Amino acid sequence: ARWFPKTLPCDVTLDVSKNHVIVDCTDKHLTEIPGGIPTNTTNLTLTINHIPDISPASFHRLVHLVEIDFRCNCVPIRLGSKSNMCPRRLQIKPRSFSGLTYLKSLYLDGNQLLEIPQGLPPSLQLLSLEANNIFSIRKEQLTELANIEILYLGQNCYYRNPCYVSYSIEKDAFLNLTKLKVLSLKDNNVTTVPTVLPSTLTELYLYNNMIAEIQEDDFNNLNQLQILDLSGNCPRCYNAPFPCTPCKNNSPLQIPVNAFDALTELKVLRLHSNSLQHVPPRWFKNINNLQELDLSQNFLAKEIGDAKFLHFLPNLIQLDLSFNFELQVYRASMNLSQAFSSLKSLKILRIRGYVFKELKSFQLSPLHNLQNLEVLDLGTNFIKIANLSMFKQFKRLKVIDLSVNKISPVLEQLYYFRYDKYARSCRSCYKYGQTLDLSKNSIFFIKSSDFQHLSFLKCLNLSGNLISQTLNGSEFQPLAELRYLDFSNNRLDLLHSTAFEELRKLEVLDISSNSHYFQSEGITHMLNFTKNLKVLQKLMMNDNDISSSTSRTMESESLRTLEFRGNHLDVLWRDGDNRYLQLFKNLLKLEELDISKNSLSFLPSGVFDGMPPNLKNLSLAKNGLKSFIWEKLRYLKNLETLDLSHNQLTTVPERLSNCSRSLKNLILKNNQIRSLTKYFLQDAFQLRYLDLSSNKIQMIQKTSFPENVLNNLKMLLLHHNRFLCTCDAVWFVWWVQHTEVTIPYLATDVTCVGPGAHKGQSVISLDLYTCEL
Amino acid sequence: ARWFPKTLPCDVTLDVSKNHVIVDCTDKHLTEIPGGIPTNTTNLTLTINHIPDISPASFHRLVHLVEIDFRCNCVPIRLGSKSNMCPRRLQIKPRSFSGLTYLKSLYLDGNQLLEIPQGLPPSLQLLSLEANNIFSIRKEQLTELANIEILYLGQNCYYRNPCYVSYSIEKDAFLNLTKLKVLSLKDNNVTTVPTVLPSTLTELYLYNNMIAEIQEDDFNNLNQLQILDLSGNCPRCYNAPFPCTPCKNNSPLQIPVNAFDALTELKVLRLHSNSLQHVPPRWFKNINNLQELDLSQNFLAKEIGDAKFLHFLPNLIQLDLSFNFELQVYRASMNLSQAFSSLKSLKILRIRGYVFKELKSFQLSPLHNLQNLEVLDLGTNFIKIANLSMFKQFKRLKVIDLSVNKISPVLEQLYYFRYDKYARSCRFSCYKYGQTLDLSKNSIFFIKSSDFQHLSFLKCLNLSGNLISQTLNGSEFQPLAELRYLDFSNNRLDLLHSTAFEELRKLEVLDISSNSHYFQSEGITHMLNFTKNLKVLQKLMMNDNDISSSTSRTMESESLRTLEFRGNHLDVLWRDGDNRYLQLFKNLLKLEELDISKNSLSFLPSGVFDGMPPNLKNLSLAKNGLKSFIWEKLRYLKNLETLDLSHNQLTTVPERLSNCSRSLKNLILKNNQIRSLTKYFLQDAFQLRYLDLSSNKIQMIQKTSFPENVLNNLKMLLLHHNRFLCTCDAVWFVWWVQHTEVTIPYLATDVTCVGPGAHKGQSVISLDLYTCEL
RNA sequence: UUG
RNA sequence: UUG
C-alpha cells in the first residue's frame, strides 16, 4: 500500500493547514542526527538522545525549520541517568544556526552548555537554556537576541546542578532586548534583581534564588508586568524535602512598601516561602488588577487574624495562605480577620497548614458573603472537631476540602513542599457538583445526624478513614441528592444487604480497599446490596480480597460498570463449586467488567454463560491464566474489548471469527504465545485493535494475518517478540515495511533475534534481496 | 573430580545408616520412568509426572524397593491442572508389583484408578489410594492386603471428584485385615459405618460423608481405637465455602448414648460440623483417657452454658467449641457453665464464633483455677467491650487470643470453614517471648496507659491491624514493664514525638510496618530518631511505610541489630544532590542486618556505603530497579558477608570481586540482566561461599572467571535459567558442570542450552561435545 | 533524562 | 497437580 517504506526512526506528521512538517525523534537512542529528515521539515524534536555535537552539516538542507527542540542530549550529571551518564558536554560548532532563516524557537536545555550559543538567527523569538552551566550573563552575549520574546535561563545553578558561585548578570544586560516578554532566572543562585529590565516584560520569574532584598526601583519601569514570582528567596525551611538555606538572622525577603507601585498591570504575585511575618497593605496601593496571590510557606499565622492588606484586593480570584503555622504551636481555633469579607471576587481560598484543633461555624463568618467562593481548602490542619453542618452556609461552593485532618466524633501530592513545582521535564468527583472532601481523617463511626443540613451534597469523599461499621441504610439519611460516594480505604462490613440504600440518587459508589472484614473466615457478606440502588451506574469494589459471599447473585437494573479487581474469584469459582457461576448474570445492563487480578489461572466452564447479556469490555488481565477455551466467547454476544494482557497463554484460537463475531479489541500483550494458528484472523472483519506485543512469536504468515483484516486495524502491536528474519519471513517483513497500519515502536523494538547476521536488527530496515536471487 | 557424571533427572541420596538409597523424581515432566535408576534403590518417588502406565518393566531391576511414591500421574480433572489435563487414567499391567518382595509402602493416589490394584506383594504395610475413582469396596479385592496396617481410600467420591452414587462397602470387607491399624474413608459419600471392622484399628477417619446415624454397636469391638473422626456428617452449612448439603429437618448426626462404650483407649474424638444440639454426658461414661475433643461448627450455644459432660473429662487437653453461635443472634455476653472448672488437665480452650458483645471478668471465672491452661482463644466473636485487666488472673497462660473482634474504647487463616483441613497434597510470631495478648484486627483507635493496668506480666502485645491513629509520646504503654515484643503494624502511627515507645524499657522487637498513612502527606513532622531511647531494642521493622521524608537526619541506637526498611522511598531521601540523609543509619552502631529492598533505588548516590554503620554484614538492595552499581564502593563495608542484589537490572559484575570486598561470603545476583562474566570475576575470592547467578542472560562462562580453588569452597552455585550457548567454545563449561562436586540445583530441570539449533532445549548435563575433539 |  |  506504500511504494517507499519509511525508514527514518522518527514519527513524521503533516499539518498541511499550517504547512507544518513535524518530525519527532524523541527518545530513539540516536547518536547522530538521522539522515533523510524531510527537507520541508518545520518542527524537529531530538530530545533525549546522545547526539554529541551540532554543526553546519546538522541542519544544512533543513532551511524551513521554525522550531528546533534539541534538549537533554547531555543532561548534567545529578539530573540525568546514572546508568548512562553523558561523558562530554554538547559541542555546537560555529554556523550551526545562522542559516536557519525561519527559526523561531530553539530549545537547548540540559546539554551542559557553558555559554550562550552565538550565531543565532535574527528571527528567533524563544530561546531556552535551562539546566545548563551558564551562570554569567553578559550584555555582549545577548546582542544577537534582539528580537527575542521568551528567554529561559533557569536551573543553571542550584543544588541539583551546582555552579559553586553567585549568578552574575551585567548591568542593563537585558535592557536592549526591546521585545523581551518572559524572563525566567529561577533556581539560579541569583543575588539581586537584575536592572534595568526592559519595560516590555510581561512575566518575570526570579524564584528560588539568593535575593535577600528588593530595591524600591527594581521594578520601576515594568508597567506591563502581569506575573512576578519572587518565591523562595529567604525560604521557610522547616521540613523542606530539598536542601534549604534560610536568610541569616531569621530575616524575611525585604520588600520596600512602594516596590510594586509601577506594576499596574500585575495579575499574579507569588511570594511563596519568603519567610514573611507581615504583609503591609501599602504594597497593594496601586495594584487593583491583582487576581492570584500566593503567600504560602511564610510566617503569617498572626497576620491571618489581622490582614488589613486584604482591603486593597477587591479583584482577587485566588488566595493561598497555606503552611504559615508557628513552629511547635497547636492553636485552639482559626482566627480569620474580618478583612477577608472584602474579597468580593474571591473564588479560591486555601489555608492548609494553619494547624488548629477545633473548627467552629463562626470562625468562617468573614466568608459568608463572598458570593463567588468556589473552593475552601482547610486540609492538613490536624483539626480534631468540626460540626459538618456549618457548611450549610456554603452551599454555593464547589469543593469544601478538609482532607488530611484528625476529624472524628486537584493539587499534586507534593505541592506546597516541592522545590520547583513548575519545573519542566525532558520530554475525581468534582464534576458531579458540590463536594465535601473528608478523605484521610479519623472518622470511626458515622450516624445520620453527622450529615445534618447537608442535603445539597453531590459528592462525599470518606476515603481513608477508620469506618469499621455495618451500614444498614440509616447512616446517610440527609444526603438525599448525593451522586458520588467514595468509601474506599475503610473497613466496611457488608453484613446488611440494605447498606447505602438511603443514598437514593447514588450513581457511583467506591467501596474499594475495604478488605478487612473479607479476609477473616466465617463472616457474612451480602454482595446483593446493589438491588436497592436504582440509579447506580458504577460500582468499584477493587482490592477487597473477596473470597466468599453469603448471597450467590448480585442484582442491578442500572449498573453499567463493575470493577472487581484484586479479589478471589478463583476461590469463589473453585472447580466443582457451581454456586457462584452467575454472580454477575443479573447485572442486566452491565457493560464493563474488570476481573483482573483474581488469580484466575483457569476459568471454569460456566463462567462465560454466567456473564450478563450486554457485556462489552471484559478484563481478565493479570490472572496467571494458563489456558483459555476461546470457543466459550460465543456466549459473550456483545463483547467488544477483551483484555487478556499479562497472563500465561501459549496459543490463540484456530479461528477468531468462529469465537466472536463482535470482538473489536483483542489485547494479548505479555503472554507466552510462540506461534499463531494457521488461519487465526481469517474473516474477522470488524476486528480493529490487536495487541500481540511482549510475546515469543517467531513467525507470522499471510494465512494467519490476511490483509483484508489487517487493513481495517486502527493499530497492531507486535513489539518485543522473537522474530526470525529468514527467507520464510519474507511476506511479514515486506508487509511491515509497506503497510499503512499503525505499528508502534518500529524504530525501537520490532527486531530480529536471528539468524545471527540479523540479530538485533530492525525489521523495518531489513533487506531480504538474497531470498529472490 | 567425578569419573561418571550423574545424568538421571532425579535427586539421589544415600542414608547409609538406614541402608536407604533415595531417588526423588518429583515434578520432572517425565513421560516414562527414567532409565538408569540405581539398582539398590529403596525409596523411589515419581509424584507429579505424566507416566501413563506401569508394567513389569517399570521396577524390573529394583528388587530392594521398600517404598514407591507414584502419586498424581493422572489427577482427576477438577483436582488437576487445567492446562495439562490427564487424558487417560493410569494403566497398571499385571504383576507390576508382585516381584517387589520388600515393598512396605505404596502410594497410588491421584491416578484416576477405577479399582483396587491387584497383585500386591504380602510385605505391604501401607497402601494409599486417595483421589482416585474407587467407590465400591469388596472383600475379594482386599484379600491380597493380609498384612496391611495403613489404608487410605478417601477423596474418591466428593464434590471435587464425584462418583454420582453412594459409596459401597461389603459387609465385613475389612474384618480379615487382622493387622489394619489406620482406616481412612473420608470425603467418600459413605452412608453407614462399615461393619464389622477389625479390633486392631487405632485410627478411624469417617469424616465428610453422608452418615446420618451411628448404630449403637458400630464401634463395639474397637477397644484399641485412639482417634475417631466422624466430622462433617450432617454438616452445619452456614457460610460454608464449599457446596454443603445438610441432613433434612436440621437433624444432627444421631449417636446413641452408648455408642462409645467400647472405646476405652480413645484419645481424640472429632465431632466437627455434625449439627449437634446436645452433648450427652452418657457419651463419655467409659472414656476417661480422652485428650482432644473438637466440637466446633455445631449448634451448641445453649449447651456451652450447661455442658454437664465436662464433668466426665478430667484428662482433656484440648477443647474446641468454636462456631456454635445461633444464626442471627448477637448475645450480650458469654455464658460458660461452671462445669468448665472440672477440666483439670485442660491446656487449650478455643471458643471462636460464639458471637457476643461484652466480655466481663466473671464470665471467665469457671477457668480461674484451671492450672494447666496455656491457650485461651476467643477470636472472631465480635466482642465490642472488654476490660483487658481481667487477664491479670491469667498470667500462667502462654497465649490470650482476642484476634478479629470489635474491641474499642498458630492456626491457618482458613481453618474452621475449610472442607478437609488434613487433605494431603500431591507434592508431599512472638509466642516464644512469653505471655502473649493478641489484640490484632480489632477496632482500637486510641490507647492510654490505664487500658493495660495490671498486665505488667505481658511479654508480647499484638496490636496489629487496629485503627490507632495517634501520636505516641511515651505515656500510652506505661504498665507494660516486661514487654519484649510489640507488633504495632497496620496502624496509623504518627511519629511526631521521638519519645514514642520509650516507656517500653525491656522492648527487644518493635514492628511498626505498614503505618504509612501519616508518611504519605507532605510537610508532616516525622521523628525517626525515636530509637535512641530503646536501650535493649534488637530488631526494628518499619517496612511499607512509604517513608520519603524525615525531620531527623540520623537514627541512633547502641543496641539495634536488625532494621527492616523495605517498601519506603530512600530514592527520595537520597535524591542526587541532597546529602542530608546519607548517614541515616550510620549511628546504628551495632547494626548487622539491613533490608532496604523495594526502595526504588535505581542508582545509589555516592556516600551511601560510607554512611552505613560499621558492623553491617547482611545488606539487601533487592527489587530496586538498580541499573548500575559501583562495585568498588563495597570496600567501605568492611564486615559485609551477604549482599542481596536479586531482582534488579544489573548488566555487569565486577572485574575482580576480591578487589571489592575481602569479607563477602554470599553474593545473590539472581534475576538481573547479566549477559557475561568478567574475565577474572572470582579470581582469589577466597571468602566466597555462595553465589547465585540464576535467572540472568549469561551465554558463556570461561575457566578464568571461575577458578577452581574458589569453586571448591562454594557451598552452592546457582546457574539455572540463563541463556547458555552450547557450541565448541563452551567445552570447558559443559565439561566442568558435568564433572563437578559443587552443588548446583536444577541441573535436570533448568540448566539448558538455548542453542545452537541442534541443541536447543537440551540439558547441558546430558550434552555430548565429542565432535569438538575429532 | 530539568520532579 | 488430592488443600
Ligand SMILES: *[C@@H]1O[C@H](CO)[C@@H](O[C@@H]2O[C@H](CO)[C@@H](O)[C@H](O)[C@H]2NC(C)=O)[C@H](O)[C@H]1NC(C)=O
Ligand atoms: C511547531 O513549532 C512551532 C514554532 O515554534 C510552534 O508554534 C508556536 O506555538 C506557540 C504556542 O503559543 C506560539 O506562541 C508561537 O508563536 C508559535 N509559532 C509559530 C511560528 O506559529 C508549534 O506549536 C509547534 N507544533 C508542534 C506540533 O511541534
Ligand SMILES: *[C@@H]1O[C@H](CO)[C@@H](O[C@@H]2O[C@H](CO)[C@@H](O)[C@H](O)[C@H]2NC(C)=O)[C@H](O)[C@H]1NC(C)=O
Ligand atoms: C551559590 O553561591 C554561593 C556563593 O555565595 C556558593 O557558596 C560558595 O561555595 C564555595 C564552594 O562550595 C565555598 O568555598 C565558598 O565559601 C561559598 N561561598 C559562600 C559565600 O558561601 C554556593 O555553593 C552556590 N550554590 C550553588 C548550588 O551553586
Ligand SMILES: *[C@@H]1O[C@H](CO)[C@@H](O[C@@H]2O[C@H](CO)[C@@H](O)[C@H](O)[C@H]2NC(C)=O)[C@H](O)[C@H]1NC(C)=O
Ligand atoms: C523410605 O521408605 C520407608 C518405608 O516406606 C519409610 O519408612 C516409614 O517412615 C515413616 C515416617 O518416617 C514411619 O512412621 C514408618 O514406620 C516407616 N515405615 C516402614 C514400613 O518402615 C521412610 O520414612 C522413607 N524415607 C524416605 C527418606 O523417603
Ligand SMILES: *[C@@H]1O[C@H](CO)[C@@H](O[C@@H]2O[C@H](CO)[C@@H](O)[C@H](O)[C@H]2NC(C)=O)[C@H](O)[C@H]1NC(C)=O
Ligand atoms: C453421593 O450420592 C448421592 C446419592 O447416593 C448422589 O446423588 C444422586 O445423584 C444423581 C446423579 O447426579 C441424581 O440423579 C440423583 O437424584 C441423586 N440421588 C440422591 C438421593 O440425591 C450424589 O451425586 C453423590 N455425590 C457425589 C459427590 O458423588
Ligand SMILES: CCCCc1nc2c(N)nc3ccccc3c2n1Cc1ccc(CN)cc1
Ligand atoms: C503542618 C504541621 C507540621 C508539624 C506537625 N507535625 C505534626 C504531626 N505529625 N502530628 C500532629 C498531631 C497533632 C497535632 C499536630 C501535629 C503536627 N504538627 C504541628 C505541631 C507539631 C508539634 C506541636 C507541639 N505540640 C504542635 C503542632
Ligand SMILES: CCCCc1nc2c(N)nc3ccccc3c2n1Cc1ccc(CN)cc1
Ligand atoms: C460468625 C458470624 C457469622 C454471621 C455474622 N456475620 C457478621 C458480620 N459481618 N458483622 C457482624 C457485626 C456485628 C455482630 C455480628 C456480625 C456478624 N455475624 C453474626 C451475626 C449476624 C447478624 C446478626 C443480626 N444482627 C447477629 C449476629
Ligand SMILES: *[C@@H]1O[C@H](CO)[C@@H](O)[C@H](O)[C@H]1NC(C)=O
Ligand atoms: C451541629 O450543628 C447543627 C446546626 O448546624 C445542630 O443542629 C447540631 O445539633 C450540632 N451538633 C453538635 C453535636 O453540636
Ligand SMILES: *[C@@H]1O[C@H](CO)[C@@H](O)[C@H](O)[C@H]1NC(C)=O
Ligand atoms: C477521594 O480522596 C482521595 C484522596 O485521599 C483521592 O485519591 C480520591 O480520588 C478522591 N475521590 C474522588 C472521587 O475524587
Ligand SMILES: *[C@@H]1O[C@H](CO)[C@@H](O)[C@H](O)[C@H]1NC(C)=O
Ligand atoms: C440501623 O442501624 C441504626 C444505627 O444503629 C439504627 O438507628 C436503626 O434502627 C437501624 N435500622 C433498621 C431498619 O434496623
Ligand SMILES: *[C@@H]1O[C@H](CO)[C@@H](O)[C@H](O)[C@H]1NC(C)=O
Ligand atoms: C440478599 O440475599 C440473601 C440470600 O442469602 C437474602 O437473605 C437477602 O434477603 C437478600 N437481600 C436483598 C436486598 O436482595
Ligand SMILES: *[C@@H]1O[C@H](CO)[C@@H](O)[C@H](O)[C@H]1NC(C)=O
Ligand atoms: C447459662 O445458660 C444455662 C443453659 O442455657 C442456664 O442453665 C444458666 O442459668 C445460664 N446462666 C447465666 C448466668 O446466664
Ligand SMILES: *[C@@H]1O[C@H](CO)[C@@H](O)[C@H](O)[C@H]1NC(C)=O
Ligand atoms: C478495669 O478493671 C480493673 C480491675 O481489674 C479496674 O482497675 C479498672 O478500673 C477497670 N476499668 C474500667 C474502665 O472499667
Ligand SMILES: *[C@@H]1O[C@H](CO)[C@@H](O)[C@H](O)[C@H]1NC(C)=O
Ligand atoms: C500479630 O497478629 C497479626 C494479625 O493476625 C499476625 O499477622 C502477626 O504475625 C502477629 N504478630 C506476631 C509477632 O505474632
Ligand SMILES: *[C@@H]1O[C@H](CO)[C@@H](O)[C@H](O)[C@H]1NC(C)=O
Ligand atoms: C503525653 O500525652 C498524654 C496523652 O495525651 C498525656 O497524658 C501526657 O501529659 C503527655 N506527656 C508529655 C510528657 O507530653
Ligand SMILES: *[C@@H]1O[C@H](CO)[C@@H](O)[C@H](O)[C@H]1NC(C)=O
Ligand atoms: C531527634 O532529632 C531532632 C532534630 O530534628 C531533635 O529535635 C530531637 O530532639 C531529637 N530527639 C532525640 C531523642 O534524639
Ligand SMILES: *[C@@H]1O[C@H](CO)[C@@H](O)[C@H](O)[C@H]1NC(C)=O
Ligand atoms: C540475610 O538477611 C536476610 C533477611 O534480610 C535473611 O533472609 C538471610 O537468611 C540472611 N543471610 C545470612 C547469611 O545471614
